[PDB]
């Protein structure tokens, strides 16, 4: 045995020889650091016992356990292996208790298999029987993708395990963490997965979402497979340099799909294809977001809303947080501090705004006939809250208003509550989305405000190594109980079964409208209802860094819209650092910049009206706001087909093994660059320059750099910002809201390649109607140049939208000058258009055009 393909056969204490033997596992403490001393031996585990029996879908097998010494107590005996050969590119295969049923998730979007085996497969399944081991290899090169052998299988009541060798160290995903950099190095790493409040900071703990998927890029040509555990127990992901990959869980069943595509773009749209695509956002959640915790009172809320506006800034949404509470109880608001809400929330609608507030799920219990508190009354009647292990008491906890109860999300019966809650509330307020916060579910206490029971759920034989080691810290007893079951199997689902209600209670409250919604704790297929962001960051440099990758693996994830707390949320941030934050997050896919309570104010505008901060915010958000058309194109492929939004450099440049590591860049979609200056004090990035034609955003010029590592300067007023050759980009020109900057004239820019081509792609719908797209109700157009020649052509045509909408500016970047510019409309003139060139640039911009949206049109020019 390597030592890099030992599987630790000790993960629950400083190992012995002693504990080995009595586990039947192999003593070698002669390794380097982290390498197992105790490890498992060559037949530990189960067995195939006789043969595997052809399914329509697949095969099963029957396992049975060797005998072995019962270390994370109740064994089982005999598993059943159930295959299925889903679709080319997905396989799925679980191993249950052949004898009993247990927990598996009750997801929303995944539904069980009845079909045949797909044909045509792209991989194929071998099954080792003595011992048992699976293994599924890429058919066309034999490359073997998963391989069970390295392990065992350990399959007991409270302890599942199963491993992977791995076809290389390019693996990303895996959360909720802050893994620092993007690509897992494989290096001896355990990553805890348990839904969690608790800073996202430098020490890896389990943070506030469950995602189990990982993707591996298993060479350069861009073969590249994904890997998903649907199981909502704590677990732990165990990553070693043999290469593989260890899961561990305390309870449910292994529930396995492996996924292949030809790239990585691939992979999580097979992923996606099964979880479930992201949400369409309302275009409004793309623009900026901006929010405090604690202004205290709504005159100061007003305050700096005014002078954000003052300053003109692109700022379409307002958060208001538990401040606007009366003591911090949903669905009511201070009569005193927040006196005159209605009359606010008026006067953002007037100026073309949104309110976003946020909701807890915990309710306080404290309603007499004295004082009635609604919600609490309303919910009590329909007894929809979680309750203790005796199966009738709510449990009590304890969060922001007091003493608490916690809706049961998994009972419909609750959703029905929880809509009428918002209809009440909305009738008040007019709020336009939803931010659902502390939905771990965070407690203030740990467990019940009279803790827990010592029994095998709140105290298992095996934890993994989860923040502070005990499942119920800072949340529900693990035996509380709801109707998807015991907390110590849905407590992962707590903050999706949220999401679900609230998307519910969307429909009634925002009837066909998208809404918004915005969660911090998610599972699997969470983006097919919510926004996520990153929680409770820090004003520092680290966290600035760290948010990158955070956002790479979300989109990953399919929660495309996603971005951590701009500028940082606990401290005062530094001038310096927030500036360099703003820029960066103008390019987040969810731009949104929260504060802390009692910090202070972090606001672009708080910082001079006249200052570098916010002079530099105005810009790049403009720069944002004038991409939204790209940006909502962006957003529509992930929902309609699966992509990436903020992207990895891998994803398109996978060919070119220096960009396997990059994670200070990113891209949204396939085109735009971003560079952004991460270290305090500088005024330059070491950036890595792709294997592509870029041109500088903002000047048009093209980069003599190509496919390597360059010195950006980047002064203080500078992000970068650079457009690949190839691609066109549609844009419209900015206003201080997307309500008013989508009646504005649109753009083209052409960044043309090495062989003077380009393509783009244009989606147009009317930005905030549910079923837009399953009921083809929007525009979609193609532009491609190829010499002398753009084309504007229409795919889907089925809106028009009402605001007299038209391309009147094409910029076209890497261009010898154009002559005689002309202009067709289904074949016939058309008008002569204006060309302004710019030579020592090779940049051409054609104005006075009118190209209708949803018009076909060819222009056409000489050189
Ligand atoms: C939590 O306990 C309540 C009782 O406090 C349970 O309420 C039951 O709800 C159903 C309605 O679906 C009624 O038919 C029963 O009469 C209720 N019981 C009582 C005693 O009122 C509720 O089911 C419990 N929830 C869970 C997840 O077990
Ligand atoms: O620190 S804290 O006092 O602010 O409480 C944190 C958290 O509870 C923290 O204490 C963790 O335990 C680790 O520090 C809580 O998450 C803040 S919530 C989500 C945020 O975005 C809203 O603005 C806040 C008000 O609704
Ligand atoms: C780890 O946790 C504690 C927070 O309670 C903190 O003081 C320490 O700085 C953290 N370490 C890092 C690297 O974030
Ligand atoms: C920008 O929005 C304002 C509404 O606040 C509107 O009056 C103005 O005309 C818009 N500007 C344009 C047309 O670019």
Same mark, same amino acid.
């Given at each position: 045995?390597?030592?890099?393909?030992?599987?630790?056969?000790?993960?629950?204490?400083?190992?012995?020889?002693?504990?080995?033997?009595?586990?039947?596992?192999?003593?070698?403490?002669?390794?380097?650091?982290?390498?197992?001393?105790?490890?498992?031996?060559?037949?530990?585990?189960?067995?195939?016992?006789?043969?595997?029996?052809?399914?329509?879908?697949?095969?099963?097998?029957?396992?049975?356990?060797?005998?072995?010494?019962?270390?994370?107590?109740?064994?089982?005996?005999?598993?059943?292996?159930?295959?299925?050969?889903?679709?080319?590119?997905?396989?799925?295969?679980?191993?249950?208790?052949?004898?009993?049923?247990?927990?598996?998730?009750?997801?929303?979007?995944?539904?069980?298999?009845?079909?045949?085996?797909?044909?045509?497969?792209?991989?194929?399944?071998?099954?080792?029987?003595?011992?048992?081991?699976?293994?599924?290899?890429?058919?066309?090169?034999?490359?073997?993708?998963?391989?069970?052998?390295?392990?065992?299988?350990?399959?007991?009541?409270?302890?599942?395990?199963?491993?992977?060798?791995? /076809?290389?160290?390019?693996?990303?995903?895996?959360?909720?963490?802050?893994?620092?950099?993007?690509?897992?190095?494989?290096?001896?790493?355990?990553?805890?997965?348990?839904?969690?409040?608790?800073?996202?900071?430098?020490? *890896?703990?389990?943070?506030?979402?469950?995602?189990?998927? +990982?993707?591996?890029?298993?060479?350069?040509?861009?073969?590249?497979?994904?890997?998903?555990?649907?199981?909502?127990?704590?677990?732990?992901?165990?990553?070693?340099?043999?290469?593989?990959?260890?899961?561990?869980?305390?309870?449910?069943?292994?529930? +396995?799909?492996?996924?292949?595509?030809?790239?990585?773009?691939?992979?999580?749209?097979?992923?996606?294809?099964?979880?479930?695509?992201?949400?369409?956002?309302?275009?409004?959640?793309?623009?900026?977001?901006?929010?405090?915790?604690?202004?205290?009172?709504?005159?100061?809320?007003?305050?700096?809303?005014?002078?954000?506006?003052?300053?003109?800034?692109?700022?379409?949404?307002?958060?208001?947080?538990?401040?606007?509470?009366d003591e911090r109880r949903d669905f009511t608001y201070d009569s005193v501090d927040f006196k005159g809400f209605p009359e606010f929330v008026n006067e953002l609608h007037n100026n073309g705004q949104k309110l976003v507030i946020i909701v807890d799920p915990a309710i306080s219990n404290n309603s007499?006939?004295?004082?009635?508190?609604?919600?609490?009354?309303?919910?009590?009647?329909?007894?929809?809250?979680?309750?203790?292990?005796?199966?009738?008491?709510?449990?009590?906890?304890? !969060?922001?208003?007091?003493?608490?109860?916690?809706?049961?999300?998994?009972?419909?019966?609750?959703?029905?509550?929880?809509?009428?809650?918002?209809?009440?509330?909305?009738?008040? !307020?007019? +709020?336009?989305?939803?931010?659902?916060?502390?939905?771990?579910?965070?407690?203030?206490?740990?467990?019940?405000?009279?803790?827990?029971?010592?029994?095998?759920?709140?105290?298992?034989?095996?934890?993994?190594?989860?923040?502070?080691?005990?499942?119920?810290?800072?949340?529900?007893?693990?035996?509380?109980?709801?109707?998807?079951?015991?907390?110590?199997?849905?407590?992962?689902?707590?903050?999706?079964? #949220?999401?679900?209600?609230?998307?519910?209670?969307?429909?009634?409250?925002?009837?066909?409208?998208?809404?918004?919604?915005?969660?911090?704790?998610?599972?699997?297929?969470?983006?097919?209802?919510?926004?996520?962001?990153?929680?409770?960051?820090?004003?520092?440099?680290?966290?600035?860094?760290?948010?990158?990758?955070?956002?790479?693996?979300?989109?990953?994830?399919?929660?495309?819209?996603?971005?951590?707390?701009?500028?940082?949320?606990?401290?005062?941030?530094?001038?310096?650092?927030?500036?360099?934050? #703003?820029?960066?997050?103008?390019?987040?896919?969810?731009?949104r910049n929260h504060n802390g309570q009692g910090y202070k104010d972090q606001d672009p505008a708080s910082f001079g009206a006249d200052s570098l901060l916010l002079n530099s915010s105005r810009h790049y958000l403009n720069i944002r706001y004038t991409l939204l058309p790209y940006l909502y194109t962006?957003?529509?492929?992930?929902?309609?087909?699966?992509?990436? !939004?903020?992207?990895?450099?891998?994803?398109?440049?996978?060919?070119?093994?220096?960009?396997?590591? !990059?994670?200070?860049?990113?891209?949204?979609?396939?085109?735009?660059?971003?560079?952004?200056?991460?270290?305090?004090?500088?005024?330059?990035?070491?950036?890595?320059?792709?294997?592509?034609?870029?041109?500088?955003?903002?000047?048009?010029?093209?980069?003599?750099?190509?496919?390597?590592?360059?010195?950006?300067?980047? /002064?203080?007023?500078?992000?970068?910002?650079?457009?690949?050759?190839?691609?066109?980009?549609?844009?419209?020109?900015?206003?201080?809201?997307?309500?008013?900057?989508?009646?504005?004239?649109?753009?083209?820019?052409?960044?043309?390649?090495?062989?003077?081509?380009?393509?783009?792609?244009?989606?147009?719908?009317? *930005?905030?109607?549910?079923?837009?797209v399953a009921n083809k109700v929007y525009l979609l157009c193609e532009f491609s140049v190829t010499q002398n020649r753009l084309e504007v052509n229409i795919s889907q045509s089925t809106y028009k939208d009402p605001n007299n909408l038209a391309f009147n500016e094409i910029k076209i970047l890497g261009?010898?000058?154009?002559?005689?510019?002309?202009?067709?409309?289904?074949?016939?003139?058309?008008?002569?258009?204006?060309?302004?060139?710019?030579?020592?640039?090779?940049?051409?911009?054609?104005?006075?055009?009118?190209?209708?949206?949803?018009?076909?049109?060819?222009?056409?020019?000489?050189?």
């Open positions: 045995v390597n030592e890099l393909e030992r599987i630790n056969c000790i993960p629950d204490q400083p190992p012995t020889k002693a504990t080995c033997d009595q586990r039947g596992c192999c003593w070698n403490p002669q390794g380097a650091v982290s390498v197992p001393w105790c490890y498992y031996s060559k037949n530990h585990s189960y067995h195939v016992e006789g043969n595997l029996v052809n399914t329509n879908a697949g095969f099963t097998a029957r396992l049975k356990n060797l005998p072995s010494s019962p270390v994370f107590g109740s064994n089982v005996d005999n598993v059943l292996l159930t295959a299925e050969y889903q679709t080319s590119n997905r396989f799925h295969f679980k191993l249950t208790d052949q004898t009993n049923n247990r927990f598996e998730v009750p997801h929303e979007h995944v539904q069980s298999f009845s079909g045949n085996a797909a044909a045509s497969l792209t991989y194929q399944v071998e099954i080792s029987r003595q011992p048992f081991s699976i293994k599924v290899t890429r058919r066309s090169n034999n490359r073997v993708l998963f391989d069970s052998s390295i392990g065992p299988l350990l399959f007991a009541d409270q302890f599942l395990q199963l491993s992977t060798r791995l /076809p290389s160290t390019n693996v990303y995903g895996l959360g909720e963490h802050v893994h620092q950099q993007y690509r897992h190095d494989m290096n001896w790493k355990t990553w805890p997965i348990f839904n969690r409040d608790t800073t996202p900071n430098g020490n *890896g703990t389990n943070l506030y979402g469950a995602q189990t998927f +990982f993707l591996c890029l298993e060479d350069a040509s861009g073969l590249s497979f994904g890997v998903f555990l649907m199981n909502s127990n704590a677990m732990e992901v165990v990553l070693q340099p043999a290469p593989a990959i260890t899961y561990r869980t305390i309870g449910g069943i292994l529930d +396995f799909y492996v996924f292949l595509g030809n790239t990585p773009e691939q992979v999580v749209q097979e992923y996606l294809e099964l979880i479930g695509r992201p949400a369409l956002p309302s275009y409004w959640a793309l623009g900026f977001h901006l929010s405090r915790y604690e202004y205290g009172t709504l005159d100061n809320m007003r305050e700096v809303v005014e002078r954000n506006r003052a300053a003109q800034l692109p700022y379409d949404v307002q958060h208001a947080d538990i401040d606007y509470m007499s006939s004295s004082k009635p508190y609604g919600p609490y009354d309303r919910g009590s009647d329909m007894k929809i809250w979680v309750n203790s292990s005796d199966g009738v008491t709510p449990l009590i906890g304890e !969060v922001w208003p007091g003493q608490t109860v916690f809706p049961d999300y998994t009972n419909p019966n609750c959703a029905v509550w929880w809509t009428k809650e918002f209809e009440l509330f909305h009738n008040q !307020v007019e +709020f336009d989305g939803i931010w659902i916060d502390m939905n771990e579910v965070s407690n203030f206490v740990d467990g019940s405000v009279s803790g827990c029971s010592t029994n095998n759920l709140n105290n298992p034989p095996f934890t993994p190594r989860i923040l502070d080691g005990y499942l119920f810290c800072k949340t529900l007893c693990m035996d509380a109980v709801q109707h998807w079951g015991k907390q110590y199997d849905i407590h992962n689902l707590y903050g999706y079964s #949220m999401a679900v209600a609230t998307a519910e209670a969307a429909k009634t409250v925002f009837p066909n409208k998208r809404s918004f919604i915005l969660t911090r704790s998610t599972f699997a297929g969470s983006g097919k209802f919510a926004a996520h962001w990153l929680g409770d960051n820090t004003a520092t440099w680290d966290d600035l860094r760290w948010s990158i990758p955070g956002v790479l693996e979300f989109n990953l994830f399919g929660i495309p819209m996603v971005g951590p707390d701009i500028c940082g949320f606990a401290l005062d941030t530094p001038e310096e650092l927030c500036r360099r934050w #703003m820029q960066l997050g103008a390019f987040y896919p969810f731009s962006l957003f529509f492929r992930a929902h309609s087909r699966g992509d990436t !939004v903020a992207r990895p450099l891998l994803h398109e440049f996978y060919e070119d093994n220096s960009t396997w590591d !990059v994670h200070q860049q990113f891209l949204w979609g396939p085109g735009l660059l971003i560079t952004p200056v991460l270290d305090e004090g500088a005024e330059k990035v070491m950036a890595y320059v792709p294997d592509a034609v870029w041109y500088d955003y903002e000047t048009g010029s093209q980069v003599r750099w190509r496919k390597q590592k360059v010195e950006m300067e980047l /002064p203080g007023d500078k992000i970068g910002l650079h457009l690949r050759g190839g691609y066109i980009f549609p844009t419209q020109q900015p206003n201080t809201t997307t309500l008013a900057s989508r009646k504005n004239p649109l753009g083209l820019i052409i960044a043309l390649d090495e062989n003077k081509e380009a393509k783009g792609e244009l989606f147009w719908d009317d *930005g905030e109607t549910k079923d837009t261009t010898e000058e154009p002559s005689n510019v002309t202009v067709k409309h289904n074949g016939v003139p058309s008008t002569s258009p204006t060309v302004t060139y710019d030579s020592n640039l090779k940049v051409a911009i054609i104005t006075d055009i009118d190209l209708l949206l949803g018009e076909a049109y060819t222009v056409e020019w000489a050189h």
